[PDB]
Design a protein around this ligand. Structure first.
Ligand SMILES: *[C@@H]1O[C@H](CO)[C@@H](O)[C@H](O)[C@H]1NC(C)=O
Lengths: 48, 48, 48, 48
């Protein structure tokens, strides 16, 4: 998932983009992919 | 030939020219640098 | 093309770092990549 | 079909015995031709 970011793959956001782009883009990935863990983690804890 | 062409068509026409089965460097486009605004959107013209 | 030894690589701009092998997988002719679930790049095809 | 200036064609050259109508049965259709032309089509007619 793109989490609104302009690509799925990090490299292709890395490569293509200027850091002041990449930064603001790479956040959306991170903040998304991060939050995906906390979901996945919590599910474990609750399940476990 | 894309730049050094003679007349460029008016705006309500234009030519989408395939450049293919070939190698295209971008320095000679980029680093020639008489180009007023070379403004990339996704890519960073070094990365090309 | 180094094989079965961990290499960085780029194939046609599609990059990563992998351990390249040879494969039983049979493309259909027109194809280029493979994948698997994650937006993995699983198999490729030697471009040359 | 024509997708944004491309064009596609898929195929089977495949045997049947029935006079009147389709053998009811499933077949996938892998592409033969791919043409990123740029033409549009609103209508058509076969030939004989
Ligand atoms: C690379 O050269 C080989 C000949 O050794 C040829 O078979 C192959 O088609 C070439 N690559 C491409 C992409 O055409």
């Amino acid at each position: 998932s793109n989490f609104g970011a302009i690509s799925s793959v990090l490299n292709d956001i890395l490569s293509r983009l200027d850091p002041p782009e990449a930064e603001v883009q790479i956040d959306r990935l991170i903040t998304g992919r991060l939050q995906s863990l906390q979901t996945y983690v919590t599910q474990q804890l609750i399940r476990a | 030939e894309v730049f050094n062409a003679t007349r460029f068509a008016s705006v309500y026409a234009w030519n989408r020219k395939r450049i293919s089965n070939c190698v295209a460097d971008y320095s000679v486009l980029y680093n020639s640098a008489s180009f007023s605004t070379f403004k990339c959107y996704g890519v960073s013209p070094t990365k090309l | 093309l180094v094989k079965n030894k961990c290499v960085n690589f780029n194939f046609n701009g599609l990059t990563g770092t992998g351990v390249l092998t040879e494969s039983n997988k049979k493309f259909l002719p027109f194809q280029q990549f493979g994948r698997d679930i994650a937006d993995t790049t699983d198999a490729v095809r030697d471009p040359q | 079909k024509n997708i944004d200036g491309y064009f596609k064609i898929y195929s089977k050259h495949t045997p049947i015995n029935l006079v009147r109508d389709l053998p009811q049965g499933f077949s996938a259709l892998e592409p033969l031709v791919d043409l990123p032309i740029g033409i549009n089509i609103t209508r058509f007619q076969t030939l004989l």
